[PDB]
């Protein structure tokens, strides 16, 4: 998906049992309702959906609006796009999300968002964290969200600052039971 009615036509002639589709979102700047509804209605072709965010500027607040129809979703990647708190609440709102990646968050992580309602993604297994602006107490309540989900298998906490003595709460949250 660069920068599209032909692919809308392509999936919208026959529909069969696709297993998984991978969506490469590249640099979404223009945003009209026709592409919102068409590219929204494409995403029900497979049984699982792998959404990839790649530097999309028009999706800074239109996460839940476009994906409201998109009930089918399996994993998601965040590559260098702005994001709001309520959109993170939409990320934690869905339960079929099993694997999640996030990269290059310059802004401070607001409370009441992803790290604060973390314990709802009850099938989380692979979680990727990079370049997140937080503080110690945000890492503490983050680790409180880590105490909830007990099906994780893979964790990335790369390139993190302002996390002095939060690792006692994080590692304390991880080393509880034989996970």
């Amino acid at each position: 998906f660069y920068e599209p009615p032909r692919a809308v036509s392509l999936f919208f002639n026959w529909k069969q049992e696709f297993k998984t589709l991978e969506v490469t979102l590249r640099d979404i700047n223009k945003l009209n309702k026709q592409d919102i509804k068409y590219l929204g209605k494409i995403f029900s072709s497979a049984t699982n959906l792998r959404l990839h965010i790649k530097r999309c500027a028009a999706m800074a607040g239109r996460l839940s609006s476009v994906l409201r129809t998109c009930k089918n979703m399996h994993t998601l990647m965040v590559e260098a796009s702005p994001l709001t708190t309520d959109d993170e609440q939409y990320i934690t709102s869905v339960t079929g999300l099993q694997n999640l990646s996030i990269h290059r968050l310059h802004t401070q992580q607001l409370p009441g968002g992803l790290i604060d309602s973390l314990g709802n993604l009850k099938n989380l297994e692979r979680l990727i964290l990079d370049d997140i602006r937080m503080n110690e107490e945000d890492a503490k309540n983050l680790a409180e969200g880590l105490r909830s989900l007990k099906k994780m298998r893979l964790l990335h906490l790369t390139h993190l600052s302002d996390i002095g003595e939060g690792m006692d709460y994080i590692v304390k949250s991880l080393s509880e039971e034989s996970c």
């Binding site: 919208f12 002639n13 529909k15 209605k41 995403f43 129809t69 009930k71």
Partner: protein, 1199 residues
């Protein structure tokens, strides 16, 4: 009737205010006429040639002509009004060649007084015609006053009254002084015509140069002053000093006594008068030619590098002549008629380039290959080629005067390289700078193509040519010509069979030599006579002439086998060998240019189906080894009854000729083989070709689909009308009337028939056996009007002319609508058929003006009336007293008026036989008083349907409704009853409660869990909105409905009885067979459709067809799961409503709804899905469209 006169004011006055402009000095030029009277729309039945020579003129818009004497626009050219005659009623060589052939007999009247009175002799025994009459006659007696005979033979000739009643100026100021006498009709620049070097003479448009002497023709309104004098006088010395040889180059790119006296001898010989003769009147032998007495065709001029270049005319051939040229057509027909046309009309000289063409040479090479040149065939088939002039010296007379030599060469297709000077002339066509013509067919255009610049195609214009030939040669009979032209728009593909204009002589013998077409004019007699001519022409034994007939008949079996028309030339296993027999026979030909494997073509694509009809009677009344297994084989490949109307109409009506009847019971057995089917719909609609009424055939599918859309028995009733109609025509014309009669009695029974008898002579063979039909129907919606159109493509006339004394005529059917009058003649028809029939079925649909019709109807009729339907009458007293006083009434349905009948009610409680009622929207607490007058009469009752507005008296109802032994379907609804105990008593004290309609009466259903266990054989139950909780009615109606596995139709309403009732009730109705209709309105929240989902997964459901889930609370992806399994695994269902959640239900996840459309398309046997109360878009329109077209067994998706 009048609409042609009012519409005559409409378009004739609309055109009268439009195009009055006429330049009556301009419109006399011939080339602009036959140019622009050619390439216009041409959809009329009138010849453009002699309408360009009628005295009028026209552009090419819809036929509006004008004139100079009577200046008025005239269009809409239709039948029998000859525009040369309509010109009147709306206001040297020919005489020389005439008396050249003068016989010895006619000398009681002198020939020179025939010369001085305008007579033309046609070169036969003593027969004459004028130059503009068209009637050649003999009948010479003594005292024949010749011009007065011409006013006394026949009144056809209105030419009778139409004809009876310079040397000192050799300078440009004196030349220009002669140019000041300028004619008005030339708008060309006069000064440039002065400077062109001419000077004027004194007549119309000729003009005389002084240097060389240029005067000549082609002078018109939009020409060039210099161009004609340059390119047709390239040796004018003043022009040579004006524009020399390098300057005539753009005009070049724009456009001896033995030899001379030889040209005088051959010029005297090539004007032969007996050369006119053609066998186009072969055995008819009418006294007339084929140019002055016959119309023409046009030229499809095609370029060699595939553009279709123009469609030129016959003088347009003369304009830009071709030095070597090929035309395609039919030998014997038009092509040799075109060559003999060129020579014989070259003996006339009317066109302004004629008399200056030098030496034409007619030649047909199909006879000869005589390895010798000019003296062989000119001395052989003609008079002679000269002996003092050698045959090469004759060829030297060719090759010394080449520039005006015109050749009329025919049939290289029967020629090889064996003639010496001929084939070396054709292969070295430069060495004679001559004009060469040739007329080879479309099998061997490729050998001529090496020596061609352009190709010419002869093509008939059957808009006007067939009515010109059948007009002029058959003015003796013009009412069948009216049948022809009215048949041209009843059958708009009449041009699709008239494909060669000079093989219409079979039609000519099928009027003058076969008078049977005058009362039997449809298509199969006509081209049956053409096929009979193909037996007569080339009369021979059982050669592959005959196996070319049968073998191209099975080429036609391959033609309609896989609907392939332009063939592949692979499978020549059908016909194969000796292509000269098949192209000489001319049932086919092949492709001209390159293909990979070249392509066969036909003279007529629908004519090929008639060839397959000849193949079908060949495969119907011949050797029974496997031949009739082939005719039976393809005759069983066409086994769908909805395709039968159109395809069996055209093709099996081609089979309706050839009356042999050796396996006509097998093909009418295929007509009985057609049984109640549904897939016949798209069995027809999938096919490609539809023959004659082609977009109308698309409309036939639309209307018959509209017939099955509403009424299954009216659709199959129309199917019965066309099957019994075409089977009746084929049965009587096949004369298998006592051979197949009890099988036709099998073809009659059970079918309900509307009364159509005007093909009575086909039917009246034995009507007593042909009388045991299931029903008889008349009505007065648009179906019978379309059937009036269908015979238009009476009752007692064919019905009493059918039988003078009918016997045991079965029962009858009546519908009437609101637009009915009271004409007494059809009431006398009703008197006849009511006197004939057993009893009457009778339906009143809003019919006003029927009181004045029901008084003489029952006045003429006696007391034998069964069924009366009382749809929204006036309810007056006298006509229901007259209906009242007739006994033996059996059926009366009354469901419409708020006004209540009283005397008809309480006096309807007298007689016996009545079994039908109805009491919708009346209101009665106290009208039941003389109902106990009925109570001793009738234990015979079969329809009870009551409505009151309030509570009536119930003791009589429980008494004698308890006294019913013969229970039936019931309709009960809608009052303040408040009595479950009397209804508990009457429903508890009876026996046969198996079709109960209790739709929405104010009632407590404590009775039903007591009386539903009393009767187990119930089949149909309907209930409208009641009280229905989820433990009382769910447990007690779970037991009561749980022990009721005999039901077929279920209509359960409107409760908060919740999904436990779906557990037990969807459990038991899931687990009972013989069930068809099911309805859960105002109930089934999403867990109850989980119950229909998991219940509908396992099955036990396969009998069901009808189902309604109207009024859910919310359908979403939940409904995609529940309607995924429930609308997946059940391949018999056909009915679904999802609707009336009206404001905003686009919370359905529309693309998963598209997946639900995939899921409904999994279901094979569905018909009607109702997807109402949400938005679509463009996308799901394309989705349900495309996945609707996967199997087309469904038709009813409703938005």
């Amino acid at each position: 009737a009048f609409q042609v006169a009012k519409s005559q004011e409409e378009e004739e006055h609309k055109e009268r205010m439009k195009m009055k402009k006429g330049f009556n000095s301009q419109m006399r030029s011939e080339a602009k006429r036959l140019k622009t009277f050619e390439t216009y729309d041409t959809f009329r039945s009138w010849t453009p040639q002699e309408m360009a020579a009628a005295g009028f003129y026209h552009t090419g818009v819809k036929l509006g002509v004008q004139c100079f004497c009577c200046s008025l626009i005239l269009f809409g050219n239709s039948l029998r009004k000859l525009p040369i005659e309509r010109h009147k009623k709306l206001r040297e060589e020919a005489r020389l060649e005439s008396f050249e052939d003068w016989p010895f007999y006619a000398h009681g009247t002198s020939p020179r007084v025939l010369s001085a009175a305008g007579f033309v002799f046609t070169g036969k025994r003593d027969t004459v015609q004028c130059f503009s009459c068209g009637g050649s006659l003999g009948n010479w007696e003594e005292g024949d006053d010749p011009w007065k005979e011409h006013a006394k033979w026949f009144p056809k000739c209105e030419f009778l009254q139409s004809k009876k009643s310079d040397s000192v100026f050799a300078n440009e100021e004196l030349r220009m002084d002669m140019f000041k006498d300028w004619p008005q009709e030339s708008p060309v620049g006069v000064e440039a015509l002065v400077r062109a070097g001419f000077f004027y003479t004194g007549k119309k448009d000729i003009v005389r140069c002084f240097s060389c002497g240029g005067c000549l023709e082609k002078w018109a309104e939009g020409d060039d002053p210099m161009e004609d004098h340059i390119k047709f006088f390239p040796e004018c010395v003043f022009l040579q000093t004006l524009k020399s040889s390098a300057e005539v180059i753009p005009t070049l790119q724009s456009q001896f006594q033995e030899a001379r006296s030889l040209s005088e001898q051959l010029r005297d010989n090539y004007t032969k008068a007996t050369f006119r003769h053609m066998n186009l009147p072969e055995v008819c032998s009418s006294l007339g030619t084929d140019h002055l007495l016959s119309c023409d065709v046009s030229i499809i001029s095609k370029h060699i590098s595939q553009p279709v270049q123009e469609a030129l005319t016959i003088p347009e051939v003369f304009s830009n002549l071709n030095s070597v040229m090929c035309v395609e057509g039919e030998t014997g027909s038009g092509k040799t008629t075109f060559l003999k046309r060129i020579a014989f009309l070259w003996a006339s000289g009317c066109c302004p380039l004629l008399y200056r063409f030098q030496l034409v040479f007619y030649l047909s090479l199909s006879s000869i290959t005589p390895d010798q040149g000019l003296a062989n065939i000119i001395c052989a088939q003609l008079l002679g080629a000269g002996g003092c002039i050698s045959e090469v010296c004759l060829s030297s007379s060719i090759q010394q005067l080449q520039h005006q030599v015109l050749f009329l060469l025919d049939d290289y297709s029967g020629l090889a390289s064996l003639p010496q000077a001929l084939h070396t002339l054709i292969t070295k066509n430069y060495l004679s700078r001559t004009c060469l013509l040739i007329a080879v067919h479309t099998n061997r255009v490729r050998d001529i193509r090496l020596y061609l610049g352009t190709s010419l195609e002869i093509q008939e214009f059957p808009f006007y040519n067939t009515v010109s030939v059948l007009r002029k040669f058959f003015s003796h009979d013009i009412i069948c010509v009216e049948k022809l032209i009215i048949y041209f728009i009843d059958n708009k593909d009449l041009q699709g069979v008239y494909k060669t204009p000079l093989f219409v002589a079979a039609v000519c013998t099928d009027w003058i030599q076969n008078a049977s077409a005058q009362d039997k004019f449809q298509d199969v007699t006509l081209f049956q006579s053409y096929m009979q001519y193909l037996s007569l022409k080339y009369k021979a034994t059982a050669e592959p002439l005959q196996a070319t007939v049968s073998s191209c008949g099975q080429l036609a079996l391959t033609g309609l086998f896989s609907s392939c028309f332009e063939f592949n030339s692979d499978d020549l296993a059908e016909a194969g060998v000796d292509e000269d027999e098949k192209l000489t026979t001319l049932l086919m030909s092949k492709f001209t240019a390159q293909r990979l494997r070249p392509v066969y073509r036909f003279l007529g694509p629908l004519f090929q189906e008639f060839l397959a009809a000849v193949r079908l009677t060949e495969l119907l009344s011949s050797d029974r080894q496997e031949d009739q297994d082939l005719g039976l084989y393809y005759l069983r490949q066409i086994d769908s009854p909805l395709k039968a109307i159109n395809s069996f109409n055209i093709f099996l009506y081609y089979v309706s000729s050839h009356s042999s009847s050796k396996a006509a019971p097998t093909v009418v057995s295929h007509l009985l083989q057609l049984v109640d089917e549904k897939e016949s719909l798209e069995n027809m609609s999938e096919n490609e070709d539809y023959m004659k009424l082609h977009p109308q055939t698309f409309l036939w599918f639309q209307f018959v689909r509209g017939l099955w859309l509403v009424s299954p028995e009216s659709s199959s009733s129309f199917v019965s009308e066309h099957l019994l109609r075409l089977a009746l025509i084929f049965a009587y014309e096949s004369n298998t009337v006592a051979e197949c009669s009890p099988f036709i009695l099998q073809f009659l029974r059970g079918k309900t028939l509307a009364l159509r008898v005007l093909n009575l002579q086909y039917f009246r063979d034995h009507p007593e056996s042909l009388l045991l039909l299931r029903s008889l129907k008349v009505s007065i919606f648009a179906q019978d009007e379309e059937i009036i159109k269908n015979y238009e493509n009476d009752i007692s006339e064919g019905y009493w002319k059918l039988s003078p004394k009918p016997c045991k005529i079965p029962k009858l059917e009546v519908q009437v609508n609101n637009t009915d009058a009271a004409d007494q003649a059809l009431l006398q028809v009703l008197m006849e058929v009511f006197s004939a029939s057993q009893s009457i079925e009778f339906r009143l649909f809003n019919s006003s003006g029927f009181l004045e019709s029901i008084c003489p109807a029952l006045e003429l009729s006696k007391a034998s009336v069964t069924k009366c339907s009382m749809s929204r009458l006036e309810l007056s007293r006298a006509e229901q007293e007259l209906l009242l006083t007739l006994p033996a009434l059996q059926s009366l349905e009354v469901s419409e008026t708020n006004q209540l009948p009283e005397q008809l009610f309480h006096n309807l409680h007298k007689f016996l036989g009545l079994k039908e009622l109805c009491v919708r929207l009346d209101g009665k607490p106290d009208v039941l008083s003389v109902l106990p007058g009925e109570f001793p009469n009738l234990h015979h009752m079969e329809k009870l349907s009551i409505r009151t507005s309030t509570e009536s008296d119930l003791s009589k109802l429980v008494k004698f409704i308890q006294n019913f032994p013969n229970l039936h379907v019931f309709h009960l609804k809608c009052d303040f009853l408040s009595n479950c105990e009397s209804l508990m008593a009457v429903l508890a004290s009876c026996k046969k409660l198996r079709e109960i309609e209790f739709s929405g009466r104010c009632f407590e259903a404590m009775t039903f869990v007591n009386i539903l266990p009393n009767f187990v054989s119930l089949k149909i139950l309907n209930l409208k909105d009641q009280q229905f909780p989820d433990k009382e009615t769910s447990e007690k109606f779970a037991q009561a409905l749980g022990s009721l596995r005999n039901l077929e139709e279920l209509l359960v309403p409107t409760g908060d009885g919740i999904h436990q009732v779906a557990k037990l009730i969807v459990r038991q109705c899931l687990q009972l067979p013989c069930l068809r209709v099911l309805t859960f309105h105002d109930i089934l929240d999403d867990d109850s459709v989980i119950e229909i989902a998991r219940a509908a997964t396992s099955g036990g459901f396969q009998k069901l067809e009808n189902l309604d889930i109207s009024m859910n609370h919310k359908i979403t992806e939940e409904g995609y799961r529940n309607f995924f399994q429930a609308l997946d695994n059940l391949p018999n269902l056909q009915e679904l409503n999802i609707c009336r959640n009206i404001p905003g239900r686009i919370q359905v996840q529309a693309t998963t709804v598209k997946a639900l459309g995939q899921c409904v398309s999994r279901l094979p046997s569905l018909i009607r899905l109702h997807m109402l109360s949400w938005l679509l878009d463009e996308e799901d329109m394309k989705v349900i469209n495309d996945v609707k077209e996967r199997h087309p067994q469904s038709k009813r998706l409703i938005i």
